[PDB]
Ligand SMILES: Cc1cc2nc3c(=O)[nH]c(=O)nc-3n(C[C@@H](O)[C@H](O)[C@H](O)COP(=O)(O)OP(=O)(O)OC[C@H]3O[C@@H](n4cnc5c(N)ncnc54)[C@H](O)[C@@H]3O)c2cc1C
């Protein structure tokens with residue numbers, strides 16, 4: 163078989179890229195290691211930047227989002243016995259963010275793809291990439307036990323952190339930047355009303371806590387935990403008690419608790435690889451970079467990489483301007499580094515780090531006081547949180 | 554002998570406090586360990602916030618400053634092959650800073666004090682403080698070999714980092730926060746025209762460099778150096794060559810060099826003690842806190858502590874409101890911590906730290922790019938640099 167663009171991975175990155183390309187008349191095949199059900203089982207992110215919202219509308223997959231998504235104009239930060247609200251709309255010049263689950267976004271895209279008849283091969287095992295620096299690269303994989311070959315012009319690696327695509331680039335061509343945090347986030351999804359209409363990030367002496375939501379009757383909470391903890395050590399009862407201990411009393415008393423629909427621990431990490439391409443292979447999303455979830459940039463960076471790759475492929479196919487594809491990494495990296503800096507800052511000011519001396523604790527508190535108390539300070543948070551403009 | 558306020562130390566803190574109190578009719582005696590000449594030999598700071606400028610005018614010691622001081626509306630930051638100017642006046646809402654040497658400020662104050670006839674005892678050896686928690690505290694010292702006693706109501710410890718006053722508070726009553734940096738600054742004073750009309754802070758791979766001035770024919774430069782270096786290892790020739798290697802070529806080529814008038818190495822440190830008082834003793838300036846010079850806040854924080862202490866003593870003496878003095882530490886610490894946070898930030902983004910991994914170097918560069926490229930980012934630098942308003 164042959165196609166124009168081969169896409170490895172059927173998470174939001176690959177599905178979004180595949181839908182945009184399909185609509186533009188550029189044929190693409192998506193290869194996914196897992197089953198549709200397995201992909202839809204992942205909870206993950208819940209905050210979308212306007213750029214991604216617009217991209218979804220452009221891919222023609224925004225009906226349910228427009229209907230069910232919640233537009234937020236602010237967010238709160240609680241620390242040292244106080245709650246500070248950042249008016250994102252006012253401080254960013256009218257921009258806002260939309261709360262709509264990643265699971266929902268993925269489901270919307272999967273439906274759209276199924277309906278349009280574009281090619282998607284689930285359970286594509288042992289995917290391998292070949293002749294990346296040739297005129298005609300190709301992908302091989304096994305279906306049922308048979309090894310198939312897919313010829314193409316370009317390959318988009320949208321296979322996440324553990325995908326085969328980043329592994330397929332000669333190690334000596336890549337420059338990796340990484341930072342692992344000494345803690346993870348224990349998240350819990352519950353069919354209960356959110357404790358607030360906006361998100362509450364809380365820096366507490368016992369550790370970080372985050373109150374989020376998915377809808378009016380679905381909440382998503384997180385608590386910072388050491389990397390040594392295992393989810394089976396945390397009953398729902400234990401989680402709720404801990405969450406409450408980390409929240410302002412007035413918030414903790416309004417909290418409606420209930421049984422978890424999902425509960426898991428995800429460790430924190432920062433990761434960037436440079437460049438993000440090699441020959442006919444272009445990396446996008448988690449395959450190229452990782453940000454701690456504190457700033458809600460993961461899914462959002464996948465969106466901007468895809469937007470950039472899609473527009474460059476359009477120039478290549480529609481206008482015969484293939485040379486522009488060489489600029490992919492430079493364009494994406496500029497946005498990526500700024501989002502990595504913000505996520506890192508967000509993480510350092512909201513979490514409790516092990517082995518912190520007195521000076522550092524005081525500086526962490528002063529960072530909060532300064533940034534949340536100055537108009538210019540609030541503005542730096544807001545503009546970064548709503549998301550810097552696409553290039 | 555007896556006085557109302559005993560002041561330990563004749564650097565800018567004590568002299569400024571003594572002049573303000575004198576003018577307000579509150580008698581004060583200043584005790585200094587060194588000679589007038591030794592004090593005037595210190596070069597140190599060169600940038601004054603408007604608050605300090607106004608305080609000097611209030612103490613009636615601003616003629617020469619108004620005449621010789623240089624008002625700066627901006628400052629530049631050079632990094633990764635580029636020079637970025639921060640328009641302080643525009644970004645701070647019309648505020649500026651004044652370049653007038655600390656040596657000059659000290660000389661102006663010493664003259665004013667000498668002329669008004671207020672008491673100053675130089676070469677006051679082995680100063681000791683007594684009955685700090687009594688109704689009537691006192692200071693003892695040796696002059697000529699004779700041990701004298703000075704009775705007073707209050708004692709202001711303006712004796713710097715190594716003064717006897719902070720040492721006189723029961724250690725268990727103080728909470729210290731400290732951070733030592735792995736480098737020092739090698740400074741050089743030269744009788745040459747400045748390379749720029751505004752300051753240039755430079756982050757270079759070889760290390761930090763700063764181009765400052767004292768007048769139109771007097772420059773002050775600094776270069777970051779390891780704590781293992783000794784000034785005798787640095788000839789003028791070696792310094793100039795190193796400075797040039799750390800500056801943008803166009804700047805380096807305009808540089809007029811010459812023999813040093815002064816040259817020395819000063820290590821970097823952050824230090825805060827809480828509280829800043831004990832009984833009838835109040836600490837001010839370097840006796841209570843230290844900031845790395847990167848943000849030019851040392852002399853400026855001494856000024857705000859003195860302004861706060863002076864105004865509280867005025868209420869106590871003029872209005873009989875002695876209770877207000879209990880609020881001294883709380884008021885000062887709020888400003889101190891914000892200035893410590895800024896000086897720390899300034900230091901971390903402009904210096905080259907030993908043992909920095911790839912991720913951190915990239916984040917340091919991105920911090921610069923973000924802050925110097927965003928209106929909100931520039932504003933956070935400007936408002937902090939001109940100095941936050943006195944409380
Ligand atoms: C465990 C986890 C929890 C997260 N939680 C949060 C959160 O709480 N908040 C937040 O803001 N962000 C969170 N994120 C970030 C998340 O939103 C990601 O940024 C987002 O899923 C990235 O989307 P993709 O790049 O499409 O990658 P994804 O990882 O979502 O998808 C990649 C796809 O490639 C497939 N694939 C893998 N290897 C393959 C191969 N060899 N061949 C074929 N297919 C292959 C995978 O099966 C997967 O379907 C989380 C991420 C993870 C990994």
Ligand SMILES: Cc1cc2nc3c(=O)[nH]c(=O)nc-3n(C[C@@H](O)[C@H](O)[C@H](O)COP(=O)(O)OP(=O)(O)OC[C@H]3O[C@@H](n4cnc5c(N)ncnc54)[C@H](O)[C@@H]3O)c2cc1C
Nearest residue numbers: 562564565566586597598712713716838839846849851852
């Ligand atoms: C070596 C050095 C270099 C510096 N360089 C810079 C720079 O380049 N840029 C910048 O922005 N800042 C710099 N600073 C900071 C500087 O500006 C200080 O913040 C400022 O001098 C503090 O003023 P005071 O609190 O009055 O203390 P000071 O240290 O100036 O004065 C305290 C006085 O108390 C006296 N004293 C000490 N112990 C005594 C005792 N037991 N009895 C009696 N008298 C006693 C001392 O002799 C001294 O005269 C530097 C500081 C130092 C120490």
